[PDB]
């Protein structure tokens, strides 16, 4: 008979995290537009 | 008791009548910054940060 590495296995709780894609956006951006006229 | 015409006093209640017009105005235009919501629902994110 063979003798082979055997497991064995029982329940456990889990987590489950789920991978997404995505971008980072800056938090507080004010593109300075001028709101006044000239050069 | 008379001291004054009618009619100026009507001119008097008129220009009063105007100027409490003007003074809406000038309110509605100060309740359009501090801008309210109009309707009342679930609201997503600020396409426009503070500062721009």
Known sequence: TP???IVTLEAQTVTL??????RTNAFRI????PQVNGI | ????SKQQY????AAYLQ???AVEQARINLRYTKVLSPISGRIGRSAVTEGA
């Open chain 2, 19 to 21: 100027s409490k017009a």
């Open chain 1, 30 to 33: 004010a593109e300075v537009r």
């Open chain 2, 10 to 13: 009507a001119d008097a209640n």
């Open chain 2, 1 to 4: 008791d008379q001291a004054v």
């Open chain 1, 17 to 22: 995290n789920t991978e997404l894609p995505g």
């Open chain 1, 3 to 5: 003798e082979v590495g």
